[PDB]
């Protein structure tokens, strides 16, 4: 791919974070805390899952960013509608306003309904996310494997402003404490 030149500087929005997340001072890294992080509740915070949104909202153009997933066992990444449900249980699907991939139990899958098996020969340490708003495209790239394509959502019906979407995953195993990090341009 030649998407690097649409690179955008993403920062995390503290106010959207699940109350157990710890976001770094520079708002470029997030990890699961071992307890409630002593913040007030609000209608923006994801309640059920360890999720957080980027601060940036996109309604046009082409945008590209990279996320470090080194040594994580579980995570979700992609984009979502600004108006996604925050409270209670829900599935990650385009019908619910999410365009995502994930790792779970040693398999990678795209957040279609039902979910789609991904074919990744080189487990990624960094993921590139490309959004073309006008074309209705969200693509995912394996930066560890020379930028190889992972998955393309096409004919996307965004139906509103988009925000970068992150899930650090739970850490029941003690093997998933590592952060998500936004990689430098």
Ligand X SMILES: COC(=O)N1CCN(c2ccc(F)cc2)CC1
Which residues contact ligand X (rule: CB under 6 A)?
A: 31, 70-71, 177-179
Q: Which residue is nearest to ligand X (CB)?
A: 71
For ligand X, which is the closer residue by CB, 31 or 45? 31
For ligand X, which is the closer residue by CB, 7 or 22? 22
Distance CA 114, CA 116 (A): 7
In the complex, minimum distance from the CB of residue 119 to ligand X, in angstroms, rounded to a whole number: 24
For ligand X, which is the closer residue by CB, 26 or 134? 26
Q: Is 99 helix (H, G, I), strand (E, B) or coil?
A: strand
Beta strands in the chain (DSSP E): 21-23, 29-32, 51-53, 62-68, 75-81, 98-104, 107-110, 116-117, 126-132, 137-142, 148-153, 162-167, 180-182
For ligand X, which is the closer residue by CB, 48 or 71? 71
In the complex, minimum distance from the CB of residue 76 to ligand X, in angstroms, rounded to a whole number: 18
In the complex, minimum distance from the CB of residue 71 to ligand X, in angstroms, rounded to a whole number: 3
> At a CB cut-off of 8 Å and minimum separation 6, what does 21 contact?
30, 31, 32, 33, 37, 50, 52, 168
For ligand X, which is the closer residue by CB, 32 or 80? 32
| Residue entry with tokens 């393309």 | 152
In the complex, minimum distance from the CB of residue 37 to ligand X, in angstroms, rounded to a whole number: 13
For ligand X, which is the closer residue by CB, 24 or 107? 24
In the complex, minimum distance from the CB of residue 62 to ligand X, in angstroms, rounded to a whole number: 30
In the complex, minimum distance from the CB of residue 102 to ligand X, in angstroms, rounded to a whole number: 18
In contact, 173 and 71? CB cutoff 8 Å: no
In contact, 82 and 161? CB cutoff 8 Å: yes
In contact, 164 and 145? CB cutoff 8 Å: no
């Amino acid at each position: 791919h030649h998407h690097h030149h649409h690179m955008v500087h993403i920062t995390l929005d503290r106010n959207t974070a699940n109350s157990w997340l710890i976001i770094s001072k520079d708002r470029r890294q997030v990890r699961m805390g071992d307890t409630h992080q002593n913040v007030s509740d609000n209608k923006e915070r994801f309640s059920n899952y360890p999720m957080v949104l980027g601060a940036q909202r996109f309604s046009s153009g082409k945008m590209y960013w990279e996320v470090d997933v080194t040594q994580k066992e579980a995570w979700d990444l992609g984009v979502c509608r600004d108006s996604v449900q925050r409270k209670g249980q829900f599935s990650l699907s385009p019908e619910n306003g999410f365009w995502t991939i994930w790792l779970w139990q040693d398999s990678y899958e795209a957040g279609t309904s039902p979910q789609t098996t991904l074919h990744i020969q080189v487990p990624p340490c960094q993921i590139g996310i490309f959004v073309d708003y006008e074309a209705g495209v969200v693509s995912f790239y394996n930066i560890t494997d020379h930028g190889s394509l992972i998955y393309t959502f096409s004919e996307c019906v965004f139906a509103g402003p988009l925000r970068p979407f992150f899930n650090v995953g739970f850490n029941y195993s003690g093997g998933n404490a590592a952060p998500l990090k936004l990689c430098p341009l």
